[PDB]
Amino acid sequence: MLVKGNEILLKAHKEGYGVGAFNFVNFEMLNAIFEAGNEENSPLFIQASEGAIKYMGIDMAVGMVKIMCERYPHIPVALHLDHGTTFESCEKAVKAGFTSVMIDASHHAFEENLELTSKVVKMAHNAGVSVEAELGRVLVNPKEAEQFVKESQVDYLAPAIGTSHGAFKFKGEPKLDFERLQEVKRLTNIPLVLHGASAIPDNVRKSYLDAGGDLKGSKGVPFEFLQESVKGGINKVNTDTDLRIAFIAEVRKVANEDKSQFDLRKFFSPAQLALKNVVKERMKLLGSANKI
Amino acid sequence: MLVKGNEILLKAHKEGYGVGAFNFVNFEMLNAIFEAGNEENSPLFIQASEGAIKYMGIDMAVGMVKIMCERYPHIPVALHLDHGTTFESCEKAVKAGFTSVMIDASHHAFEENLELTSKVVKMAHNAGVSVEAELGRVLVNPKEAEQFVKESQVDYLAPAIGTSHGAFKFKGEPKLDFERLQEVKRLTNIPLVLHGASAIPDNVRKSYLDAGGDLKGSKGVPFEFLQESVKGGINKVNTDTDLRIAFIAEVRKVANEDKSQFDLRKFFSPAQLALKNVVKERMKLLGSANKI
Ligand code: NA
Ligand code: NA
Ligand SMILES: [Zn+2]
Ligand SMILES: [Zn+2]
Ligand SMILES: [Zn+2]
Ligand SMILES: [Zn+2]
Numbered sequence: 001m002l003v004k005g006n007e008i009l010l011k012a013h014k015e016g017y018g019v020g021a022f023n024f025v026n027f028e029m030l031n032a033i034f035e036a037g038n039e040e041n042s043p044l045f046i047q048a049s050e051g052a053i054k055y056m057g058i059d060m061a062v063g064m065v066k067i068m069c070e071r072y073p074h075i076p077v078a079l080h081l082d083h084g085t086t087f088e089s090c091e092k093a094v095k096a097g098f099t100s101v102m103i104d105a106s107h108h109a110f111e112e113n114l115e116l117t118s119k120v121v122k123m124a125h126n127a128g129v130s131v132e133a134e135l136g137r138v139l140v141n142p143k144e145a146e147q148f149v150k151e152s153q154v155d156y157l158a159p160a161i162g163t164s165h166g167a168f169k170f171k172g173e174p175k176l177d178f179e180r181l182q183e184v185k186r187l188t189n190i191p192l193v194l195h196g197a198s199a200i201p202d203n204v205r206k207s208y209l210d211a212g213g214d215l216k217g218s219k220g221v222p223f224e225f226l227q228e229s230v231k232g233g234i235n236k237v238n239t240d241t242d243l244r245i246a247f248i249a250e251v252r253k254v255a256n257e258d259k260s261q262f263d264l265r266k267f268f269s270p271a272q273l274a275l276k277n278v279v280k281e282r283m284k285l286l287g288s289a290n291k292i
Numbered sequence: 293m294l295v296k297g298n299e300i301l302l303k304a305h306k307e308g309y310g311v312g313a314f315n316f317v318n319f320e321m322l323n324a325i326f327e328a329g330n331e332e333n334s335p336l337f338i339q340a341s342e343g344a345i346k347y348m349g350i351d352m353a354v355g356m357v358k359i360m361c362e363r364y365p366h367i368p369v370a371l372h373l374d375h376g377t378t379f380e381s382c383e384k385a386v387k388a389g390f391t392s393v394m395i396d397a398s399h400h401a402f403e404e405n406l407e408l409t410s411k412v413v414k415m416a417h418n419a420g421v422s423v424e425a426e427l428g429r430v431l432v433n434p435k436e437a438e439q440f441v442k443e444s445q446v447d448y449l450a451p452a453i454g455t456s457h458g459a460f461k462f463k464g465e466p467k468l469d470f471e472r473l474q475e476v477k478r479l480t481n482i483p484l485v486l487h488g489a490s491a492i493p494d495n496v497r498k499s500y501l502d503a504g505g506d507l508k509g510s511k512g513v514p515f516e517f518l519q520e521s522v523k524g525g526i527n528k529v530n531t532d533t534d535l536r537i538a539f540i541a542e543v544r545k546v547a548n549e550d551k552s553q554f555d556l557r558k559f560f561s562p563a564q565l566a567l568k569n570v571v572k573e574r575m576k577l578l579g580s581a582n583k584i
Pocket of ligand 1: 082102132238
């Protein structure tokens with residue numbers, strides 16, 4: 001059932017596992033994410049970026065998730081606004097029925113970030129909705145994180161410890177500041193969020209290139225860094241790129257191998273399966289499998 | 293809003309125009325169809341095959357359409373089960389919120405076709421749902437059609453007048469029996485349905501071939517035959533193949549021109565536009581534009 005984001009992440013926080021936060025932009029992605037959670041007996045964070053919401057319509061985004069929740073009413077599900085850019089955007093998500101909203105003001109100075117975050121928190125908490133904020137761009141200041149969390153009363157925090165959104169994360173070898181993660185965790189004692197957490201698994205890379213795609217030397221967060229992140233206190237692991245590559249790899253493959261194929265189901269049933277499997281493996285990696 | 297299929301088709305019947313019946317299998321197809329209906333001020337018949345319902349789940353098929361209707365509440369919309377093959381399938385569609393159901397028993401002899409159709413009609417009319425049936429494979433016997441409609445109470449009839457499904461309709465020159473259509477129309481005085489009515493326009497074919505697609509010498513119903521069909525009494529024009537070809541053309545196109553592209557919206561926003569334009573033009577051709 002559809003629940004406050006903090007309901008899910010407080011449990012992950014206390015028990016020391018990570019919950020994948022999986023972006024979707026249409027029915028096929030959403031269906032595959034839900035089937036993965038059902039098969040791995042794992043809670044789900046479902047997130048939609050502002051762009052995904054513009055594409056679907058916020059009414060469709062919420063509506064499709066509510067249908068999927070009724071289909072799998074035993075799975076805890078949070079519906080999360082990913083990288084909300086304005087108070088008004090977070091407010092619209094709250095009104096539409098999102099159960100978690102992220103406000104990204106990390107590009108502002110501390111005082112302005114804190115002020116905007118606090119305003120979102122007041123609004124969202126009055127409506128029973130949980131709030132994520134971000135600190136750091138470059139890396140988080142743990143004492144700043146400590147005061148930020150206490151002052152804003154935000155539910156979870158994304159501290160910058162060395163990740164970038166999308167492919168092409170690291171200018172070489174993957175590096176994450178785990179001692180800084182541990183300090184943030186110690187001082188804030190709340191669920192923490194990792195952005196830019198796609199790993200680009202080798203099998204997903206191989207299916208994408210074998211289908212003719214070009215990943216342009218992208219580097220994901222290695223699996224061991226994700227596991228060490230969770231050990232350091234990460235409880236929400238934002239995952240988008242991995243899903244998109246796996247999905248479009250299969251779409252490209254169908255197009256290549258049958259130039260007369262125009263039944264959408266023939267493109268998107270294998271795409272769903274590939275996406276579903278990435279999610280299932282990620283739920284096992286992060287420790288959310290069998291936590292229902 | 294969401295209305296009984298007969299509400300839309302009775303108006304078309306009485307005023308002598310055709311309403312396109314457009315199949316969907318996911319959100320992108322449904323969104324494009326609805327934007328077309330909104331931009332051409334046209335009533336909408338939205339169709340889901342049994343395969344599409346299995347792919348989406350009938351709860352999602354109905355759910356997404358209801359969301360779309362609330363987004364465009366000035367548009368009359370019927371949600372129609374396309375080629376229901378059993379009573380139980382039609383009954384499940386009625387229970388899920390479909391407003392029109394088609395039972396295809398045209399492969400049975402007249403007596404068994406009529407018996408199953410009448411059983412579906414009694415169930416669906418008790419629930420306020422309209423019913424379509426089919427006669428002919430062999431082209432329709434107009435005198436059978438007259439008795440069939442009188443005895444079954446079915447709301448609209450698909451008579452076989454020379455069309456098959458999907459691509460590869462005519463292995464030569466297009467040809468439809470308009471004399472037999474006019475007779476069926478005169479004897480039944482109900483809305484009539486044309487199955488296998490995709491035209492495969494030249495521009496859609498070209499886009500698909502331009503993107504490396506292979507249409508294997510497929511040929512559709514020419515626009516002038518579709519217009520002569522509506523002149524003869526066709527009021528519902530089943531359209532599916534044209535939508536898929538135009539959609540997948542743009543998908544293949546995006547895959548070909550950028551091997552690093554894996555943002556789903558970059559594949560499906562141009563796909564939606566190409567599908568919307570096919571639908572808009574078809575609505576103009578059939579005479580449903582500006583009938584809202
Ligand atoms: Na987020
Ligand atoms: Na039909
Ligand atoms: Zn992010
Ligand atoms: Zn971020
Ligand atoms: Zn048909
Ligand atoms: Zn048929």
